Amino acid sequence: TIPHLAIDPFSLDFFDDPYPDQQTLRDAGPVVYLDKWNVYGVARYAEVHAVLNDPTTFCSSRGVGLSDFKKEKPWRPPSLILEADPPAHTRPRAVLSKVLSPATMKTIRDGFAAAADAKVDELLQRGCIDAIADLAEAYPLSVFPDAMGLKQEGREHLLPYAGLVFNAFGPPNELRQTAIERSAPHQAYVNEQCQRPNLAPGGFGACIHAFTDTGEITPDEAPLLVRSLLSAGLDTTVNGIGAAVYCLARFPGELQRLRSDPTLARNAFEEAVRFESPVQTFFRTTTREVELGGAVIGEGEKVLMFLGSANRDPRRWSDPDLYDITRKTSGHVGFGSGVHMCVGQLVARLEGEVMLSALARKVAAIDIDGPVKRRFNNTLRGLESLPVKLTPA
Numbered sequence: 001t002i003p004h005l006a007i008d009p010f011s012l013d014f015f016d017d018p019y020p021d022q023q024t025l026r027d028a029g030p031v032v033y034l035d036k037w038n039v040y041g042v043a044r045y046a047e048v049h050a051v052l053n054d055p056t057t058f059c060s061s062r063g064v065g066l067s068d069f070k071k072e073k074p075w076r077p078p079s080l081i082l083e084a085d086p087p088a089h090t091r092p093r094a095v096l097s098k099v100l101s102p103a104t105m106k107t108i109r110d111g112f113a114a115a116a117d118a119k120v121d122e123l124l125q126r127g128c129i130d131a132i133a134d135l136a137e138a139y140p141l142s143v144f145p146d147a148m149g150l151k152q153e154g155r156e157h158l159l160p161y162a163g164l165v166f167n168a169f170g171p172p173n174e175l176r177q178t179a180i181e182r183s184a185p186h187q188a189y190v191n192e193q194c195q196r197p198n199l200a201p202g203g204f205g206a207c208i209h210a211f212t213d214t215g216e217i218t219p220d221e222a223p224l225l226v227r228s229l230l231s232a233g234l235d236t237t238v239n240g241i242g243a244a245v246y247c248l249a250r251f252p253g254e255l256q257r258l259r260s261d262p263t264l265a266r267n268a269f270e271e272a273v274r275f276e277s278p279v280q281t282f283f284r285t286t287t288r289e290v291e292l293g294g295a296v297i298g299e300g301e302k303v304l305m306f307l308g309s310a311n312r313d314p315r316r317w318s319d320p321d322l323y324d325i326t327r328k329t330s331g332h333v334g335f336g337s338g339v340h341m342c343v344g345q346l347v348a349r350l351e352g353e354v355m356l357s358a359l360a361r362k363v364a365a366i367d368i369d370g371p372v373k374r375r376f377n378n379t380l381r382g383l384e385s386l387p388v389k390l391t392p393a
């Protein structure tokens with residue numbers, strides 16, 4: 001009933017160009033079995049969306065990586081939000097929602113926007129730059145650690161820690177094993193910064209600790225919730241902004257439309273999130289036998305969702321392989337869907353919007369002018385190096 005495929009979605013070949021294999025996975029059926037890892041897979045929009053929106057049946061508390069927490073020990077203490085199901089998920093989620101809330105974005109927008117304009121002005125003085133190290137990495141590093149309230153010392157641990165976290169959702173391949181081998185100094189730094197005395201007043205970390213007297217979380221839960229923002233809050237945005245710049249570099253007609261109406265900046269970023277999907281895949285575990293898209297899956301089985309594939313599924317999207325900054329993007333799954341849908345999406349969209357606004361107002365052309373190099377991670381998609389020449393408007 002269910003087709004068995006040998007495709008390895010965690011292989012370097014797949015990362016280098018996932019799109020043909022994703023079509024093969026979608027077209028094989030609504031539910032496939034991946035023999036390489038003994039997991040079920042769903043690559044169509046319909047089933048990805050259905051799985052995400054049934055957290056009772058497709059739970060997160062057994063881990064959102066390949067590893068089943070009922071069978072193996074997690075590599076670090078489980079996240080109180082990502083790796084929790086309702087009702088345990090609900091109150092920590094509400095705290096992070098209020099910490100990263102629509103109202104909070106007002107307190108940071110002016111500074112985030114000025115830093116984006118400043119970075120684009122700096123890059124234009126150099127002309128030829130690496131849009132990864134010099135922009136996609138440099139911009140979030142210039143705003144997010146400060147908004148968290150982190151001290152300056154030790155910030156070089158943040159991107160390695162995040163890469164470790166996202167590699168650790170994969171199978172026990174070399175990318176994952178090597179990340180864990182190297183992890184001790186990054187875990188040590190990150191855990192220490194999560195303690196209340198190490199988080200500057202007014203930042204996101206201090207605000208999480210301030211919620212420990214309302215009855216929503218206790219003091220001993222706050223450090224792990226700070227850990228969540230230090231895990232998911234930087235490397236995702238690096239790959240999102242890198243994706244947007246890569247899209248504008250490859251589709252100059254869309255850069256021209258963005259220049260002509262900079263208020264398209266926010267949707268141009270959302271479309272980049274759909275088109276490249278910085279978070280490509282992750283898992284749920286079944287809590288019962290379940291029928292999904294006409295197939296029967298037993299209890300206790302890992303189900304791999306292909307978010308990037310769902311975002312390119314022609315059953316859902318017109319011209320899915322085109323980057324279109326005026327596309328109606330509502331419904332894409334690049335930030336997830338349902339109860340776990342990205343709690344930091346307003347921070348991500350703010351960074352992306354203000355960066356693309358700066359480019360729209362200040363840059364006339366973005367031309368790739370060197371070898372493009374991909375960065376390999378078990379669940380994040382993005383580039384290692386993107387040499388571009390920026391021409392001023």
Ligand code: HEM
Nearest residue numbers: 081082232233236237240334335336340342343344347348
């Ligand atoms: C372009 C940038 C980003 C992308 C593509 C992205 C993607 C996602 C996705 C797909 C999920 C759902 C995971 C699941 O259902 O298991 C998620 C959850 C989450 N994200 Fe984001 N994210 C981004 C930025 C951020 C930022 C900036 C923050 C914090 C400042 C953040 C914090 C979180 C947290 C804490 C969760 C867990 C929420 C929950 O389990 O209820 N993310 N993100």
Ligand SMILES: O=C(O)c1ccc(-c2cccs2)cc1
Nearest residue numbers: 079082227228231232279282
């Ligand atoms: O530590 C945390 O709570 C944490 C939360 C979310 C993530 C993401 C996984 C996949 C997309 S976002 C990773 C870590």
Ligand SMILES: [Cl-]
Nearest residue numbers: 076187190191
């Ligand atoms: Cl840790």
